[PDB]
Short mmCIF file of all heavy atoms in Angstrom, two decimals:
data_model
loop_
_atom_site.label_atom_id
_atom_site.label_comp_id
_atom_site.label_asym_id
_atom_site.label_seq_id
_atom_site.Cartn_x
_atom_site.Cartn_y
_atom_site.Cartn_z
N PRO S 1 -26.80 29.05 -10.08
CA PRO S 1 -26.39 27.74 -10.66
C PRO S 1 -25.24 27.91 -11.68
O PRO S 1 -25.38 28.62 -12.61
CB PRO S 1 -27.66 27.24 -11.32
CG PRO S 1 -28.79 28.02 -10.66
CD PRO S 1 -28.23 29.35 -10.40
N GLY S 2 -24.13 27.19 -11.38
CA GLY S 2 -23.00 27.25 -12.27
C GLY S 2 -21.75 28.00 -11.63
O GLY S 2 -20.74 28.16 -12.36
N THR S 3 -21.87 28.35 -10.36
CA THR S 3 -20.80 29.07 -9.73
C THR S 3 -19.61 28.10 -9.40
O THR S 3 -19.81 27.05 -8.96
CB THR S 3 -21.27 29.82 -8.45
OG1 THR S 3 -20.27 30.65 -7.92
CG2 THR S 3 -21.70 28.94 -7.38
N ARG S 4 -18.41 28.61 -9.72
CA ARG S 4 -17.20 27.88 -9.41
C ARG S 4 -16.38 28.60 -8.30
O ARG S 4 -15.15 28.39 -8.24
CB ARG S 4 -16.31 27.76 -10.66
CG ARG S 4 -17.01 27.19 -11.88
CD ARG S 4 -16.24 27.52 -13.15
NE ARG S 4 -16.57 26.67 -14.21
CZ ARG S 4 -16.02 26.79 -15.45
NH1 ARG S 4 -15.10 27.72 -15.70
NH2 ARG S 4 -16.37 25.91 -16.43
N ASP S 5 -17.02 29.45 -7.53
CA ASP S 5 -16.34 30.19 -6.48
C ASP S 5 -16.86 29.85 -5.15
O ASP S 5 -17.98 30.21 -4.72
CB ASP S 5 -16.44 31.73 -6.74
CG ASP S 5 -15.50 32.56 -5.85
OD1 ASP S 5 -14.56 31.95 -5.18
OD2 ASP S 5 -15.73 33.77 -5.74
N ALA S 6 -16.05 29.07 -4.42
CA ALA S 6 -16.38 28.60 -3.03
C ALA S 6 -15.95 29.71 -2.02
O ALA S 6 -16.28 29.60 -0.84
CB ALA S 6 -15.71 27.30 -2.74
N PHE S 7 -15.15 30.71 -2.40
CA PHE S 7 -14.64 31.79 -1.53
C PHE S 7 -15.10 33.14 -1.93
O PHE S 7 -14.29 34.02 -2.23
CB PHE S 7 -13.07 31.67 -1.50
CG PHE S 7 -12.58 30.34 -0.93
CD1 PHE S 7 -12.21 29.34 -1.77
CD2 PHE S 7 -12.52 30.20 0.46
CE1 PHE S 7 -11.73 28.15 -1.22
CE2 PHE S 7 -12.05 28.98 0.97
CZ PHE S 7 -11.70 27.93 0.12
N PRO S 8 -16.41 33.47 -1.87
CA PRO S 8 -16.89 34.80 -2.26
C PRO S 8 -16.57 35.87 -1.21
O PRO S 8 -15.96 35.57 -0.20
CB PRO S 8 -18.43 34.57 -2.44
CG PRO S 8 -18.75 33.52 -1.52
CD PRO S 8 -17.59 32.58 -1.48
N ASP S 9 -16.98 37.10 -1.48
CA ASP S 9 -16.76 38.21 -0.61
C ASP S 9 -17.59 38.09 0.67
O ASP S 9 -18.59 37.43 0.71
CB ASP S 9 -17.09 39.59 -1.28
CG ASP S 9 -16.09 39.97 -2.35
OD1 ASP S 9 -14.89 40.00 -2.05
OD2 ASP S 9 -16.53 40.27 -3.51
N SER S 10 -17.10 38.73 1.80
CA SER S 10 -17.79 38.71 3.04
C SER S 10 -17.86 40.14 3.62
O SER S 10 -17.25 41.08 3.16
CB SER S 10 -17.09 37.72 3.94
OG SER S 10 -15.76 38.22 4.25
N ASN S 11 -18.55 40.33 4.74
CA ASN S 11 -18.68 41.62 5.43
C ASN S 11 -17.41 41.90 6.20
O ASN S 11 -17.05 43.12 6.22
CB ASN S 11 -19.95 41.61 6.31
CG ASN S 11 -21.22 41.78 5.54
OD1 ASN S 11 -21.20 42.11 4.33
ND2 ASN S 11 -22.39 41.49 6.16
N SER S 12 -16.70 40.92 6.70
CA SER S 12 -15.42 41.13 7.36
C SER S 12 -14.46 39.97 6.94
O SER S 12 -14.94 38.95 6.49
CB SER S 12 -15.57 41.23 8.89
OG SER S 12 -15.95 39.96 9.45
N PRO S 13 -13.15 40.16 7.02
CA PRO S 13 -12.23 39.11 6.62
C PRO S 13 -12.41 37.76 7.30
O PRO S 13 -12.64 37.75 8.50
CB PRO S 13 -10.85 39.71 6.84
CG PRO S 13 -11.05 41.13 7.03
CD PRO S 13 -12.44 41.37 7.52
N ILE S 14 -12.25 36.67 6.59
CA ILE S 14 -12.35 35.32 7.10
C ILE S 14 -11.02 34.63 6.97
O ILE S 14 -10.35 34.73 5.96
CB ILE S 14 -13.46 34.51 6.24
CG1 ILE S 14 -14.78 35.24 6.27
CG2 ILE S 14 -13.54 33.07 6.63
CD1 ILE S 14 -15.78 34.65 5.26
N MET S 15 -10.64 33.88 8.02
CA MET S 15 -9.39 33.09 7.94
C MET S 15 -9.82 31.71 7.34
O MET S 15 -10.65 31.04 7.95
CB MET S 15 -8.81 32.74 9.34
CG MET S 15 -9.07 33.80 10.39
SD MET S 15 -8.01 35.27 10.25
CE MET S 15 -6.42 34.45 10.54
N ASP S 16 -9.36 31.42 6.10
CA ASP S 16 -9.64 30.19 5.44
C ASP S 16 -8.56 29.17 5.72
O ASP S 16 -7.39 29.49 5.52
CB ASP S 16 -9.84 30.41 3.96
CG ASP S 16 -11.09 31.10 3.56
OD1 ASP S 16 -12.22 30.78 4.12
OD2 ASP S 16 -11.01 32.13 2.83
N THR S 17 -8.89 27.93 6.25
CA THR S 17 -7.85 27.00 6.56
C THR S 17 -8.19 25.56 6.12
O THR S 17 -9.15 25.00 6.61
CB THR S 17 -7.60 26.99 8.12
OG1 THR S 17 -7.13 28.31 8.42
CG2 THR S 17 -6.57 25.99 8.55
N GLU S 18 -7.39 24.96 5.23
CA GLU S 18 -7.60 23.64 4.76
C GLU S 18 -7.03 22.72 5.90
O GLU S 18 -5.86 22.91 6.25
CB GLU S 18 -6.86 23.40 3.47
CG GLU S 18 -7.27 22.05 2.90
CD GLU S 18 -6.46 21.67 1.63
OE1 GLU S 18 -5.32 21.25 1.71
OE2 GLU S 18 -7.00 21.87 0.50
N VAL S 19 -7.81 21.85 6.42
CA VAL S 19 -7.46 21.00 7.56
C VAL S 19 -8.13 19.62 7.52
O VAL S 19 -9.19 19.51 6.91
CB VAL S 19 -7.75 21.74 8.90
CG1 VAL S 19 -9.21 22.06 8.99
CG2 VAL S 19 -7.22 21.00 10.08
N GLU S 20 -7.63 18.63 8.22
CA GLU S 20 -8.28 17.30 8.33
C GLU S 20 -9.42 17.50 9.31
O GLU S 20 -9.19 17.95 10.41
CB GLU S 20 -7.29 16.23 8.75
CG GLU S 20 -7.90 14.80 8.71
CD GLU S 20 -8.17 14.29 7.31
OE1 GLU S 20 -7.43 14.61 6.39
OE2 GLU S 20 -9.13 13.47 7.20
N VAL S 21 -10.61 17.19 8.90
CA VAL S 21 -11.81 17.36 9.67
C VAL S 21 -12.32 15.96 10.08
O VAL S 21 -12.53 15.13 9.20
CB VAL S 21 -12.91 18.21 9.05
CG1 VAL S 21 -14.25 18.17 9.87
CG2 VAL S 21 -12.48 19.70 8.85
N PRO S 22 -12.49 15.73 11.32
CA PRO S 22 -12.98 14.43 11.77
C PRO S 22 -14.39 14.15 11.34
O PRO S 22 -15.22 15.02 11.41
CB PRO S 22 -12.78 14.35 13.26
CG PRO S 22 -12.74 15.78 13.70
CD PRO S 22 -12.32 16.58 12.52
N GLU S 23 -14.67 12.99 10.81
CA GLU S 23 -15.98 12.53 10.43
C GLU S 23 -16.53 11.40 11.34
O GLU S 23 -17.52 10.77 11.00
CB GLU S 23 -16.06 12.18 8.95
CG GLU S 23 -15.70 13.30 7.98
CD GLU S 23 -15.87 12.95 6.50
OE1 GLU S 23 -16.69 12.06 6.21
OE2 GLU S 23 -15.30 13.63 5.67
N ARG S 24 -15.77 11.06 12.39
CA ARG S 24 -16.18 10.03 13.41
C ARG S 24 -15.79 10.52 14.77
O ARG S 24 -15.12 11.58 14.90
CB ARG S 24 -15.37 8.75 13.10
CG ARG S 24 -15.55 8.11 11.69
CD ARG S 24 -16.89 7.33 11.60
NE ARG S 24 -17.03 6.67 10.34
CZ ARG S 24 -17.42 7.24 9.23
NH1 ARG S 24 -17.73 8.52 9.17
NH2 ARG S 24 -17.57 6.59 8.09
N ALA S 25 -16.06 9.82 15.87
CA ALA S 25 -15.61 10.14 17.22
C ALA S 25 -14.09 10.00 17.19
O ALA S 25 -13.52 9.24 16.46
CB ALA S 25 -16.22 9.16 18.17
N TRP S 26 -13.40 10.77 18.15
CA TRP S 26 -11.97 10.73 18.21
C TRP S 26 -11.49 10.70 19.64
O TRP S 26 -12.09 11.17 20.57
CB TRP S 26 -11.28 11.84 17.41
CG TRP S 26 -11.68 13.22 17.95
CD1 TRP S 26 -10.95 13.99 18.78
CD2 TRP S 26 -12.81 14.00 17.60
NE1 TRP S 26 -11.51 15.24 19.02
CE2 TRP S 26 -12.70 15.20 18.29
CE3 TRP S 26 -13.92 13.83 16.81
CZ2 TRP S 26 -13.68 16.26 18.21
CZ3 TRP S 26 -14.89 14.80 16.70
CH2 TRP S 26 -14.78 16.01 17.42
N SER S 27 -10.27 10.09 19.77
CA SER S 27 -9.62 10.11 21.07
C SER S 27 -8.52 11.10 21.17
O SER S 27 -8.27 11.59 22.29
CB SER S 27 -9.13 8.68 21.37
OG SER S 27 -10.27 7.86 21.58
N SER S 28 -7.89 11.47 20.03
CA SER S 28 -6.74 12.40 19.95
C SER S 28 -6.51 12.88 18.50
O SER S 28 -7.03 12.36 17.54
CB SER S 28 -5.47 11.77 20.54
OG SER S 28 -5.07 10.72 19.56
N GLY S 29 -5.69 13.89 18.37
CA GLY S 29 -5.32 14.49 17.06
C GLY S 29 -6.07 15.68 16.53
O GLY S 29 -5.74 16.25 15.49
N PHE S 30 -7.17 16.12 17.24
CA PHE S 30 -7.93 17.23 16.82
C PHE S 30 -8.13 18.23 17.95
O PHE S 30 -9.29 18.68 18.19
CB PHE S 30 -9.32 16.76 16.21
CG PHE S 30 -9.15 15.82 15.02
CD1 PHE S 30 -9.18 14.44 15.22
CD2 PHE S 30 -8.87 16.30 13.75
CE1 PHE S 30 -9.02 13.58 14.20
CE2 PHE S 30 -8.68 15.41 12.75
CZ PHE S 30 -8.80 14.05 12.91
N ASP S 31 -7.06 18.60 18.60
CA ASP S 31 -7.05 19.58 19.74
C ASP S 31 -7.74 20.85 19.34
O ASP S 31 -8.49 21.40 20.19
CB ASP S 31 -5.63 19.80 20.24
CG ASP S 31 -5.06 18.77 21.21
OD1 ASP S 31 -5.75 17.65 21.35
OD2 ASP S 31 -4.02 19.02 21.78
N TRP S 32 -7.48 21.36 18.15
CA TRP S 32 -8.05 22.61 17.59
C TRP S 32 -9.55 22.69 17.63
O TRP S 32 -10.14 23.75 17.75
CB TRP S 32 -7.50 22.98 16.21
CG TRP S 32 -7.89 22.04 15.08
CD1 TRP S 32 -7.23 20.90 14.70
CD2 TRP S 32 -9.09 22.13 14.25
NE1 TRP S 32 -7.91 20.30 13.69
CE2 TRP S 32 -9.06 21.08 13.42
CE3 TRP S 32 -10.14 23.04 14.20
CZ2 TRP S 32 -10.09 20.80 12.48
CZ3 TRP S 32 -11.12 22.78 13.30
CH2 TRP S 32 -11.11 21.67 12.43
N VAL S 33 -10.25 21.48 17.50
CA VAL S 33 -11.70 21.43 17.51
C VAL S 33 -12.21 21.78 18.93
O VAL S 33 -13.11 22.68 18.98
CB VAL S 33 -12.18 20.03 17.08
CG1 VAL S 33 -13.75 19.92 17.21
CG2 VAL S 33 -11.80 19.76 15.66
N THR S 34 -11.81 21.12 19.94
CA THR S 34 -12.26 21.43 21.26
C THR S 34 -11.61 22.67 21.95
O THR S 34 -12.29 23.33 22.79
CB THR S 34 -12.21 20.19 22.18
OG1 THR S 34 -10.96 19.53 22.05
CG2 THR S 34 -13.37 19.25 21.89
N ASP S 35 -10.33 22.90 21.68
CA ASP S 35 -9.63 24.06 22.21
C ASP S 35 -10.10 25.34 21.45
O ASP S 35 -9.36 25.85 20.64
CB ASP S 35 -8.09 23.90 22.21
CG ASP S 35 -7.59 22.92 23.21
OD1 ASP S 35 -7.60 23.23 24.44
OD2 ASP S 35 -7.23 21.80 22.79
N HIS S 36 -11.31 25.78 21.72
CA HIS S 36 -11.90 26.93 21.08
C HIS S 36 -12.93 27.43 22.07
O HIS S 36 -13.84 26.69 22.44
CB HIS S 36 -12.50 26.56 19.76
CG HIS S 36 -12.90 27.76 18.96
ND1 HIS S 36 -14.21 28.19 18.90
CD2 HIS S 36 -12.10 28.59 18.20
CE1 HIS S 36 -14.20 29.28 18.08
NE2 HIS S 36 -12.96 29.55 17.67
N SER S 37 -12.86 28.73 22.45
CA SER S 37 -13.78 29.32 23.38
C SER S 37 -15.08 29.92 22.73
O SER S 37 -16.02 30.26 23.48
CB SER S 37 -13.06 30.40 24.20
OG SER S 37 -12.16 31.19 23.42
N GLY S 38 -15.16 30.06 21.44
CA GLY S 38 -16.26 30.58 20.78
C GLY S 38 -17.32 29.53 20.40
O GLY S 38 -17.33 28.42 20.87
N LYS S 39 -18.23 29.93 19.52
CA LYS S 39 -19.28 29.00 19.03
C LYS S 39 -18.95 28.56 17.59
O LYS S 39 -18.55 29.36 16.79
CB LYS S 39 -20.67 29.74 19.06
CG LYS S 39 -20.82 30.71 20.29
CD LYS S 39 -22.21 30.62 20.96
CE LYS S 39 -23.25 31.32 20.20
NZ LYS S 39 -24.59 31.26 20.79
N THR S 40 -19.20 27.28 17.29
CA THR S 40 -18.85 26.70 15.93
C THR S 40 -20.11 26.08 15.33
O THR S 40 -20.94 25.50 16.00
CB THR S 40 -17.81 25.59 16.15
OG1 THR S 40 -16.60 26.13 16.77
CG2 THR S 40 -17.40 24.89 14.88
N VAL S 41 -20.28 26.25 13.99
CA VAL S 41 -21.35 25.67 13.20
C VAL S 41 -20.59 24.57 12.33
O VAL S 41 -19.70 24.97 11.48
CB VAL S 41 -22.03 26.67 12.29
CG1 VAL S 41 -23.22 26.06 11.47
CG2 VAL S 41 -22.49 27.87 13.12
N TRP S 42 -20.89 23.34 12.55
CA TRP S 42 -20.19 22.21 11.88
C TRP S 42 -21.13 21.51 10.89
O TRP S 42 -22.21 21.00 11.25
CB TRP S 42 -19.71 21.23 13.02
CG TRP S 42 -18.80 20.13 12.60
CD1 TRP S 42 -18.69 19.50 11.40
CD2 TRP S 42 -17.87 19.43 13.46
NE1 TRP S 42 -17.78 18.46 11.48
CE2 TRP S 42 -17.27 18.42 12.74
CE3 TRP S 42 -17.52 19.60 14.80
CZ2 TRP S 42 -16.27 17.57 13.29
CZ3 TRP S 42 -16.56 18.71 15.33
CH2 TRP S 42 -15.93 17.82 14.60
N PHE S 43 -20.76 21.49 9.61
CA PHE S 43 -21.56 20.86 8.57
C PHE S 43 -21.08 19.38 8.31
O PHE S 43 -19.97 19.17 7.78
CB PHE S 43 -21.51 21.62 7.21
CG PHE S 43 -22.32 22.99 7.23
CD1 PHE S 43 -21.74 24.15 7.66
CD2 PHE S 43 -23.60 22.96 6.75
CE1 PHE S 43 -22.47 25.30 7.61
CE2 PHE S 43 -24.32 24.09 6.72
CZ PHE S 43 -23.77 25.32 7.12
N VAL S 44 -21.88 18.36 8.71
CA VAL S 44 -21.61 17.03 8.52
C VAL S 44 -22.40 16.42 7.35
O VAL S 44 -23.44 17.01 6.90
CB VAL S 44 -22.01 16.23 9.81
CG1 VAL S 44 -21.14 16.63 10.97
CG2 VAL S 44 -23.50 16.37 10.11
N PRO S 45 -21.90 15.36 6.73
CA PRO S 45 -22.63 14.77 5.53
C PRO S 45 -23.97 14.07 5.77
O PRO S 45 -24.72 13.92 4.81
CB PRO S 45 -21.63 13.74 4.92
CG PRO S 45 -20.76 13.43 6.05
CD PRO S 45 -20.69 14.55 6.99
#
């Protein structure tokens, strides 16, 4: 309680990217979300 560090150390390097994240359904503009062959964990409000 009281931590001001949102970017702590990790086991392997992480690519951190500030981007517009959709919070509703979309028709276009977020190609990067679906054009990904791996698995994603998405945190919604």
Side-chain angles (χ1 to χ4, degrees):
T3 188
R4 306 161 162 180
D5 190 16
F7 298 99
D9 288 308
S10 66
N11 286 345
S12 70
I14 302 170
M15 328 283 297
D16 288 313
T17 299
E18 186 186 84
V19 60
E20 188 69 31
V21 171
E23 300 185 21
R24 300 284 183 277
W26 64 97
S27 293
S28 69
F30 302 96
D31 277 9
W32 67 268
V33 174
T34 44
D35 287 286
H36 191 260
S37 41
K39 321 222 287 181
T40 302
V41 184
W42 191 329
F43 286 88
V44 297

